[PDB]
Design a protein around this ligand. Structure first.
Ligand SMILES: Nc1ncnc2c1ncn2[C@@H]1O[C@H](CO[P@@](=O)(S)OP(=O)(O)OP(=O)(O)O)[C@@H](O)[C@H]1O
Ligand SMILES: Nc1ncnc2c1ncn2[C@@H]1O[C@H](CO[P@@](=O)(S)OP(=O)(O)OP(=O)(O)O)[C@@H](O)[C@H]1O
Lengths: 401, 401
């Protein structure tokens, strides 16, 4: 029994993710598609459009045989970390293959690059420090030390996000020596981006996207906004940002993960004067901050994730548990074959196991429902517990729950 | 030139608060009424229905010359600390008198009882000893001891609220040593209660309660609706309380003012399944905790105010500052006269002092404003720092700002 690992956030799951889930089992020759998926808040930092449950349902119907949560711990993080944790989990489940889309359909410049870099790493740090002492900044001196190599005609721009994430998966693998072989391909009824789609739904358009989405995906989104009366946007949580920053002191906000020393003053000062999440952001920007890092920071503020929480939990080199979000027939059989093999707990009912990282995913799960109006919100908050793990019948369409 | 102090929440100012003020000036023989007022969160633990700037504007034209904010420090407390703080504020302001309403026009029985409990305090306490030793609860013992000296029919009714408030005022003037003379009248355009007028407005219908409202009150009220788009209810804040108990740890929740040892768990159990502040209060209520005390707790859980900060600030024997909301030309005169004599700062613009208790005040407002739909919330927020004292001219209608 063979599975291919898929590092994903389906937000929503679109034609590109569909083609990638069919080609996964095609090109990696594994009978099973196992995805680790960001739960509620994601790597880009934003809230998911729809809960991890219903996105699970867009996935199980599009050819993903198994779906596990990527803990907030790994999910909302710099890609170097995000990659590590995700691949880590795909290896605990013993996925022999890994498969990603990318701006370079060629795996060879990925492998070549990483191998090349570790081949020279000493050179890299000598030239980095040789620029640094000359007064160069961190990313500059790194950009220079790195462009001292790799800059040949190869391209594979690692200025491109998928090349980044993919290089980082591959790096996590090699570094870890995982017996999981990586694969990649380029990205192109039709296909537009998850984000173009998203902003198109923000623009009061859903079926406009239907060419860009499979059936299950749209069918799912519709029932979500139907039930809870919203698509979740970063802006939707602005009040709770305001509120949350309203009660905190400087020293306490200093301790939140991804808040650099001294910036707490700027944050606290700016949130007052910002009638918009956008204004808030522009008031916050420093060149030591990407925009995604600012979003991530804002999430950590929202969920009150502390430097010591995150750093005492990031230390470990294995994954704390496996959260099972959903499974197919194939998925079920795979999880059954390898069940006893897991070196870490398999969490189905939350009741079974309690963990600080788990406590953190639940935390995010409660923060997620806040823009939901009640009674709907109180009922939403049930799903993290008394939700029996989703199951779906691959052959002719059945959910057994 | 002699001042009569009033202890008031004005929620909102109605024709009866008008009775209070004008009867005050007339009965005490003072030409100046100074009111110390709970601003955005009141004695029983709930929010004001309209901003303290507005209600200041109301009273200023209804015959109050000075409006001083009762710090949150003393405002959300049971009657004795509430009265301790407000009476310290009035004593700082050199009021010859303190005029409080009850169902009694007679100032005497408050005096008689006051001295009675004041002198028997030894006897009373010693009598609580024996009763706790027999196995009674403390309140039981308390009722038993009070009953021995008190049950003579004086008859001071400690049931009717404003009577209790009266008694504690008398008590504070007594142990404080203030040169203050308590006065009083029976409470009774026949006036209607503040609350039923609230329910009126809440029901969106402000038209039933008019004849009971001074005109300016009606104006500034509807002006607050039209300006900021709501009347404030406790339920407005439920979602935010729901955020607060999400982002707190039970150890952290134990340090919240009025969360007594061990209750934080009942709290957390109750919040996740409660769709309303009502239901929440319902599951929460205990014998150890009355409705209003729980509203106080829930409020402190909103402001996330810690116990040690609180104790620190309650330790101060006089009010940390005198906070100026508004003044007439008379109030301005009286102020300029007694200002030299104030022993703690007079605050007009917020930049004029820094104290932990004022931080508390400003944060209380920052929480208060949240229900306002953004950007209007931000505009409102600009006031606490923005608004300098509201100045009315009794020679009719000149506001100078
Ligand atoms: N059209 C496409 N072609 C090829 N690969 C694709 C793809 N769309 C996604 N993938 C790959 O499918 C995997 C899942 O992508 P996530 O679920 S992490 O979302 P995302 O891809 O960043 O969003 P998007 O860019 O708006 O589509 C990734 O490795 C992708 O490279
Ligand atoms: N109609 C009236 N007659 C006499 N005194 C009155 C009065 N209305 C108010 N006062 C006095 O005015 C002062 C301020 O009362 P707060 O502003 S604290 O509200 P509250 O009166 O408790 O509200 P309620 O009980 O729901 O009606 C008190 O000394 C009152 O005795």
């Amino acid at each position: 029994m063979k599975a291919v690992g898929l590092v994903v956030e389906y937000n929503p799951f679109h034609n590109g993710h569909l083609y990638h889930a069919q080609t996964a089992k095609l090109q990696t020759g594994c009978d099973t598609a196992v995805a680790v998926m960001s739960g509620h808040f994601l790597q880009r930092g934003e809230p998911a459009v729809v809960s991890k449950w219903a996105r699970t349902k867009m996935a199980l119907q599009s050819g993903v045989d198994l779906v596990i949560e990527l803990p907030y711990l790994y999910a909302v993080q710099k890609a170097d970390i995000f990659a590590r944790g995700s691949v880590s989990i795909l290896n605990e489940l013993e996925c022999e293959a890994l498969f990603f889309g990318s701006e370079n359909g060629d795996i060879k410049p990925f492998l070549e690059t990483a191998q090349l870099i570790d081949e020279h790493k000493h050179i890299l740090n000598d030239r980095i420090k040789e620029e640094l002492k000359k007064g160069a900044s961190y990313p500059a001196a790194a950009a220079i030390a790195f462009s001292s190599i790799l800059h040949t005609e190869s391209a594979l721009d690692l200025s491109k996000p998928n090349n980044i994430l993919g290089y980082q998966y591959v790096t996590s693998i090699l570094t870890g020596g995982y017996p999981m072989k990586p694969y990649t391909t380029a990205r192109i009824n039709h296909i537009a981006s998850a984000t173009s789609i998203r902003k198109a739904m923000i623009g009061q358009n859903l079926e406009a996207c239907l060419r860009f989405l499979p059936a299950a995906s749209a069918r799912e989104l519709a029932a979500y906004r139907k039930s809870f009366g919203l698509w979740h946007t970063p802006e939707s949580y602005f009040s709770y940002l305001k509120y949350s920053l309203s009660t905190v002191t400087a020293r306490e906000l200093q301790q939140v993960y991804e808040v650099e020393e001294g910036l707490e003053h700027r944050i606290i000062r700016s949130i007052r004067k910002s009638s918009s999440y956008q204004e808030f952001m522009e008031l916050l920007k420093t060149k030591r901050y990407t925009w995604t890092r600012l979003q991530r920071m804002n999430t950590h503020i929202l969920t009150r994730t502390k430097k010591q929480d995150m750093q005492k939990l990031l230390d470990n080199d294995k994954a704390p548990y496996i959260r099972l979000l959903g499974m197919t027939k194939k998925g079920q059989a795979y999880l059954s074959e390898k069940k006893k093999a897991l070196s870490v707990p398999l969490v189905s009912k939350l009741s079974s196991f309690s963990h600080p990282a788990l406590d953190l995913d639940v935390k995010a799960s409660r923060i997620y429902s806040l823009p939901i109006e009640e009674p709907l919100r109180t009922e939403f908050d049930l799903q993290e517990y008394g939700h029996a793990p989703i199951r779906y019948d691959e052959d002719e369409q059945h959910f057994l729950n």
